[PDB]
Design a protein around this ligand. Structure first.
Ligand SMILES: CN1C(=O)[C@@H](NC(=O)c2cc3ccccc3[nH]2)N=C(c2ccccc2)c2ccccc21
Length: 438
């Protein structure tokens, strides 16, 4: 009528600007900063390229013809615009699947999913996504043609239309898209983000706690006391000799290590350490009573201490050990910070003490809080993707099954806005990235 074209020009041109500006920004930032190019962002970089492709090679050749009600570009543009639209949706859907699968590797199988975290594999997947997406979509250029129709005053026009040899094939193709663009990617990412979510809920434990407090040094080093240490805080000898640490090292890893161990030997060593700390708590007649009275989070604070100072040194925390057993957490927290231990390693001690005072992991939660944030962003991106793409795919499927119904309900402004919703998905992720560093 009179307004509809105005709102269309408005919304289309706005969504074009945001999507062009938004995605080229995301690309130029990522191309600029080598520090930014993580595995997850290399995918979000392949995602932002498909969003740019959809935005420049399809959107004008949809608003302009839908605004004029006449596809006035060539038969080639008609095959091109349909080709890139389906290629884009495919690349995007399988980029989102790759992301869910790499975060699953990182969060759920960290020391077990080593290759899924190589940038070389990441660019292998990205290449296989674009190549296969152009391949399975070749029906669109093969079977899309100008379809002549006639307007008001018997005025010939064309519409760009995708027509397969019959109805069984038109309907088979939509079953196809249903499967490899929604069902199969949908469950893959729902199982994945579901497992990721389970893990992230179970939260911090003694191992993650000691990994934050100790770190990883592959080569022999000295701690705050000046003692020779390796791996994840593994004390080698109190003696000042370096020859003796190197000896106690080779004996513990079983090979002539030459001062240097692997990450895999550090974790094996570190697992024996947490084992040994916990056995020392159980075998010591002063520590075991306190331990049993402790809740699992505080148990881990007691283990944290015993891991740093040994069974016997901690068992001599007689006045703090008593307060803990009596559930006097504030008293214990105040007393423990008057100790020499506090004075030697304040930052670590302040955390362990916070754990004792509150019974929570707040002291160690920062990193977990970051992973949870990213994961919730990714689940939001996936849900806004499907919500932006279900309508147009459902309108094409309904056309292939009952074209007369589909066209009478959707032909005017509804499919105009349904198409608009599609392009909106390509300007969604940059806006999300903006609201993420708030
Ligand atoms: C030719 N082509 C369509 O026919 C359009 N479907 C409609 O426009 C439409 C559906 C419908 C239902 C009821 C009534 C009226 C209807 N119109 N489908 C997309 C597309 C979507 C996903 C993958 C590939 C192509 C597309 C995108 C850009 C250019 C051409 C193009």
């Amino acid at each position: 009528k009179e307004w509809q074209p105005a709102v269309q020009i408005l919304l289309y041109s706005l969504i074009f600007l945001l999507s062009v500006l938004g995605n080229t920004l995301v690309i130029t930032v990522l191309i600029r900063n080598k520090r930014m190019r993580t595995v997850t962002n290399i995918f979000l970089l392949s995602l932002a390229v498909s969003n740019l492709m959809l935005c420049l090679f399809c959107m004008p050749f949809n608003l302009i013809p839908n605004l004029l009600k006449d596809f006035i570009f060539g038969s080639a543009v008609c095959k091109t615009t349909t080709y890139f639209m389906g290629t884009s949706v495919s690349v995007s859907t399988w980029n989102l699947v790759a992301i869910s699968l790499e975060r699953y590797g990182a969060i759920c199988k960290p020391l077990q999913s080593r290759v899924w975290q190589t940038k070389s594999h990441a660019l292998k997947v990205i290449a296989a996504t674009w190549c296969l997406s152009f391949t399975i979509m070749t029906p669109y250029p093969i079977y899309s043609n100008l379809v002549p129709f006639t307007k008001n005053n018997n005025q010939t026009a064309n519409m760009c239309r995708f027509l397969l040899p019959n109805d069984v094939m038109q309907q088979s193709w939509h079953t196809f898209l249903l499967l490899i663009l929604f069902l199969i990617p949908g469950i893959v990412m729902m199982v994945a983000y579901g497992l990721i979510s389970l893990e992230l809920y179970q939260g911090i434990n003694i191992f993650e706690m000691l990994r934050i407090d100790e770190g990883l040094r592959l080569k022999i080093y000295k701690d705050t006391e000046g003692y020779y240490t390796i791996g994840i805080g593994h004390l080698l000898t109190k003696s000042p000799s370096l020859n003796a640490a190197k000896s106690e090292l080779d004996k513990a890893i079983g090979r002539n290590t030459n001062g240097v161990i692997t990450k895999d030997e550090a974790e094996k060593l570190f697992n024996q350490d947490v084992d040994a700390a916990v056995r020392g708590i159980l075998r010591n007649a002063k520590l075991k009573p306190v331990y049993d009275s402790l809740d699992a989070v505080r148990r881990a604070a007691l283990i944290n201490m015993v891991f740093q100072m040994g069974e016997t040194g901690v068992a001599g925390f007689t006045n703090s050990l008593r307060m803990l057993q009596q559930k006097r957490w504030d008293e214990a927290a105040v007393n423990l910070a008057k100790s020499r231990w506090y004075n030697q390693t304040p930052n670590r001690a302040k955390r362990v003490i916070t754990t004792f005072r509150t019974g929570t992991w707040d002291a160690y939660a920062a990193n977990l809080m970051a992973k949870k944030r990213v994961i919730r962003m990714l689940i939001v991106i996936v849900v806004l993707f499907f919500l932006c793409w279900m309508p147009i795919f459902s309108a094409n499927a309904w056309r292939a099954y009952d074209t007369a119904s589909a066209e009478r309900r959707l032909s005017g402004t509804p499919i105009s806005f349904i198409l608009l919703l599609s392009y909106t998905s390509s300007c969604v992720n940059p806006i999300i990235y903006c609201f993420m560093n708030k």
